Amino acid sequence: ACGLVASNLNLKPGECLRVRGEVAPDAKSFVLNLGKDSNNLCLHFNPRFNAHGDANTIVCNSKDGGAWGTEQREAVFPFQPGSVAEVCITFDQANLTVKLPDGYEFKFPNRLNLEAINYMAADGDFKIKCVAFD
Amino acid sequence: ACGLVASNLNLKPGECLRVRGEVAPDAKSFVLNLGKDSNNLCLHFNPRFNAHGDANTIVCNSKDGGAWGTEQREAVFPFQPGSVAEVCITFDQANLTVKLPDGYEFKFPNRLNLEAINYMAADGDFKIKCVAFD
Ligand SMILES: CO[C@@H]1[C@@H](n2cc(-c3nc(Cl)cs3)nn2)[C@@H](O)[C@@H](CO)O[C@@H]1Sc1cc(Br)cnc1C#N
Ligand SMILES: CO[C@@H]1[C@@H](n2cc(-c3nc(Cl)cs3)nn2)[C@@H](O)[C@@H](CO)O[C@@H]1Sc1cc(Br)cnc1C#N
């Protein structure tokens, strides 16, 4: 975790986390992690421009006691090298809902049953401009 | 800090950090810490409504290897219990500049000669709602 790390977030079900940043002009990939701590992530949100054998694909996963879950890939890639992008995340007992920069929404299943999200971390080719907590 | 803790901020000289939060309805005092880590703070920003023998006074200090420096007190207190408040902070080699909710500005000397601020923490009667980087 070499980008921003925030802890003690106490983000509750139905509350909105908003992250705005600028995608690097030569971006390969970037990451937003949410969960309890670095080893227990309800969401690893990983847009891949050209990385790990994916092109223009969002890969999401969970991490439970340091172990990756099953990957989920999306049908849409509303990111552009160089461009500002905002991502909004909420959750309930069943899913996280991720709203992307073109307003497209997808759900990622809530695997860890967290009562609250206490940890967020950013990494890769995305410079954070702001974060809002409900 | 029961409040938000952020690390890897990489805030550079001349960049503006904007922190917006909610002052608790019955607020006694709150803290914003900036520096290298919890033991090495270029700014401990401590508005005291009624705490530690101060009434409606901003106390600022530095912390160097765990040691509190010489306290600085301000003549102005533009905070109200049960309100939103924003503080904006920048620095150079000589001083931090703190801009308060009514636009009042004061300087606090840069005693640790930090060339980046990597650590922020909130504590006490203030819930961080938003953080912006320039
Ligand atoms: C390559 O690693 C990635 C992981 N990764 C990316 C990053 C970073 N990117 C930046 Cl930017 C900064 S840090 N850190 N770890 C992660 O995205 C994971 C999600 O399932 O996929 C593969 S590992 C993996 C997991 C499973 Br399940 C199956 N196959 C593979 C692979 N390959
Ligand atoms: C009381 O403690 C405070 C310190 N403090 C406040 C908090 C918190 N407030 C919240 Cl809300 C959450 S955590 N934690 N530690 C700090 O503000 C310090 C600044 O100089 O003054 C005194 S200690 C001190 C330092 C010096 Br130099 C001289 N006298 C004293 C005292 N007393």
From Swiss-Prot, chains A, B:
Expressed in placenta, maternal decidua and fetal membranes. Within placenta, expressed in trophoblasts, stromal cells, villous endothelium, syncytiotrophoblast apical membrane and villous stroma. Within fetal membranes, expressed in amnion, chorioamniotic mesenchyma and chorion (at protein level). Expressed in cardiac, smooth, and skeletal muscle, neurons, thymus, kidney and hematopoietic cells. It comes from the Eukaryota. SMART domains: Gal-bind_lectin, GLECT. GO terms for cellular component: collagen-containing extracellular matrix; cytoplasm; cytosol; endoplasmic reticulum lumen; extracellular exosome; extracellular region; extracellular space; galectin complex. The keyword Secreted applies. Keywords: Acetylation, Apoptosis, Cytoplasm, Extracellular matrix, Lectin, Phosphoprotein, Secreted. It is found in: Secreted, Extracellular space, Extracellular matrix; Cytoplasm; Secreted. Its main location: secreted. PROSITE patterns: GALECTIN. The keyword Nucleus does not apply. GO terms for biological process: apoptotic process; cell-cell adhesion; myoblast differentiation; negative regulation of T-helper 17 cell lineage commitment; plasma cell differentiation; positive regulation of apoptotic process; positive regulation of canonical NF-kappaB signal transduction; positive regulation of inflammatory response. A beta-D-galactoside binds at residues 44-48, 52, 61, 68-71. The modification N6-succinyllysine is found at residue 107. GO terms for molecular function: lactose binding; laminin binding; receptor ligand activity; RNA binding. Residues 3-134 form the Galectin domain. The modification N6-acetyllysine is found at residues 12, 28, 107, 127. Homodimer. Binds LGALS3BP. Interacts with CD2, CD3, CD4, CD6, CD7, CD43, ALCAM and CD45. Interacts with laminin (via poly-N-acetyllactosamine). Interacts with SUSD2. Interacts with cargo receptor TMED10; the interaction mediates the translocation from the cytoplasm into the ERGIC (endoplasmic reticulum-Golgi intermediate compartment) and thereby secretion. Interacts with CD69. Lectin that binds beta-galactoside and a wide array of complex carbohydrates. Plays a role in regulating apoptosis, cell proliferation and cell differentiation. Inhibits CD45 protein phosphatase activity and therefore the dephosphorylation of Lyn kinase. Strong inducer of T-cell apoptosis. Plays a negative role in Th17 cell differentiation via activation of the receptor CD69. This is Galectin-1. It comes from Homo sapiens (Human). The lineage of its organism: Eukaryota, Metazoa, Chordata, Craniata, Vertebrata. The gene is LGALS1.
